């Protein structure tokens, strides 16, 4: 019995790794969560967090919870720039930055080859994987970032399967961004395989969480 304190961040901010939520990051175990209700240190790049409320009930009480580098940054993406993926929407102390548990892959020079990457849940608990899908504002923006005007993403486990394509469109400026980025997640059964495959627009997971969720409910309580 010992709650998870999120300070000025909400669940979204903490679990993505908004750069203001680095201080209190991983406590090992908790019975309920305390957060700041509708803080703007959730999603720094504008968009929609899909199945958000389901995730909150998921994360509210956990018996153990271990963060791990599911796709290590300097190893898993040899044909994709894993560095330029930063933005003034997600500022960290001077520079342009991004969420800590995802990477915004962009094209290397000229050419964005089909990526594909799998992870098998060896960890014995369930694994929480989160990822992002970027929707550029214009055709130019798409070709700048990914080259491939006609790009797709695919995420799949044995339970989950979705194909995303970017809706390219100029949306109201929020935090100087006219494009949008949606956030998704799935729990990976033990011994099951998650599979990413993309030709663009995929913000890949870097960190994932192996967790042992608790019986019934936790409770999430705001300041």
């Amino acid at each position: 019995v010992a709650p998870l304190h999120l300070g000025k961040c909400n669940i979204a901010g903490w679990i993505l790794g908004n750069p203001e939520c680095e201080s209190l990051s991983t406590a090992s175990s908790w019975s309920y969560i305390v957060e700041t209700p509708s803080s703007d240190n959730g999603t720094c790049y504008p968009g929609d967090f899909i199945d958000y409320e389901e995730l909150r009930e998921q994360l509210s009480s956990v018996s153990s919870f271990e963060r791990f580098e599911i796709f290590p940054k300097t190893s898993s993406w040899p044909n994709h720039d894993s560095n330029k993926g930063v933005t003034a929407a997600c500022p960290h102390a001077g520079a342009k930055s991004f969420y800590k548990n995802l990477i915004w892959l962009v094209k290397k020079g000229n050419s964005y080859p089909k990526l594909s990457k799998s992870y098998i849940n060896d960890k014995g608990k369930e694994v929480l994987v989160l990822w992002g899908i970027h929707h550029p504002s214009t055709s130019a923006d798409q070709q700048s970032l990914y080259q491939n005007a006609d790009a797709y993403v695919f995420v799949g486990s044995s339970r989950y399967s979705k194909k995303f394509k970017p809706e390219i469109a100029i949306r109201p400026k929020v935090r100087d961004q006219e494009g949008r980025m949606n956030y998704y997640w799935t729990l990976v059964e033990p011994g099951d395989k998650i599979t990413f495959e993309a030709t663009g627009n995929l913000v890949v997971p870097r960190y994932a969480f192996a967790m042992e969720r608790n019986a019934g409910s936790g409770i999430i309580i705001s300041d």
Epitope: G109, N110, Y112, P113, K114, A140, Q147, D150, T199
Partner: antibody, heavy 124, light 111 residues
Framework: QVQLQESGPGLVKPSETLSLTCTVS??????????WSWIRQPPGKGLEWIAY???????NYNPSLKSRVTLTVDTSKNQFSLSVRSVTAADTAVYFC????????????????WGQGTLVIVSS | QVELTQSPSASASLGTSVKLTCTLS???????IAWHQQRPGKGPRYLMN???????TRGDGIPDRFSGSSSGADRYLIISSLQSEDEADYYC????????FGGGTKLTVLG
């Protein structure tokens, strides 16, 4: 196997509309990660890209000619077609049709099959 | 978007290697390209594509003696054991917002 071949008039009067048609054998304009493209070479000079379209996905045009070109694909006849409006002598060229290969695995975009090319003179 | 620069002409003797050059514009040195050959009065023929770090991948039925490499912004097409049927214009092409070509390099084969 894969062959492209151009067809249309050899001659067009100024401000009329130039209209060619490529015809693909050895393959289908529906299948594949491909775009169907047009390139011209005015006499004595280099290759200029005009535009491409695919059946499904996005078309792409050379900005200084976008306003005057229209591309169409005829799935059934295995043909695609270029239409350039308001021609002048500066549109005099050999027009080539070609397959632009979006090779998914590398992300490269390279013309791997070219037509024999057809000459179009723009003269009154 | 990118530009390609090829000097217009090259010459070399039968039997030698020749090294044709394509130069990517400043700020595009990581780009990849393709190479094409246009013998006189014919259509072009795709020869190979070429990565920024020198990996060349020939088209179908293009002989072994065609190859390629890279140094910075330059992209090379090596033709070894040069033969008199290699006399042709060689265009490089790449892609960015659009498809772009080099101006071509007319190779003359001497000997």
């Amino acid at each position: 196997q894969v062959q492209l071949q151009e067809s249309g008039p050899g001659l067009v009067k100024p401000s009329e509309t130039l209209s060619l048609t490529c015809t693909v054998s050895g393959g289908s304009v529906n299948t594949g990660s491909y775009y169907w493209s047009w390139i011209r070479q005015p006499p004595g000079k280099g290759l200029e890209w005009i535009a491409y379209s695919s059946v499904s996905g996005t078309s792409n045009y050379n900005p200084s000619l976008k306003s005057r070109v229209t591309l169409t694909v005829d799935t059934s006849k295995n043909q695609f077609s270029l239409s350039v409006r308001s021609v002048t002598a500066a549109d005099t060229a050999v027009y080539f049709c070609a397959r632009l290969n979006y090779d998914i695995l590398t992300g490269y975009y390279f013309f791997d099959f070219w037509g024999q090319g057809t000459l179009v003179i723009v003269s009154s | 978007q990118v530009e390609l620069t090829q000097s217009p002409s090259a010459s070399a003797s039968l039997g030698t290697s020749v090294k044709l050059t394509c130069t990517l514009s400043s700020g595009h040195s990581t780009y990849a390209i393709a190479w094409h050959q246009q013998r006189p009065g014919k259509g072009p023929r795709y020869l190979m594509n070429l990565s920024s770090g020198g990996r060349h991948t020939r088209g179908d039925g293009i002989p072994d003696r065609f190859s390629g490499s890279s140094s910075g912004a330059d992209r090379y097409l090596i033709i070894s054991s040069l033969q008199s049927e290699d006399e042709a214009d060689y265009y490089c092409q790449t892609w960015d917002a659009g498809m772009v070509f080099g101006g071509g390099t007319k190779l003359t084969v001497l000997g």
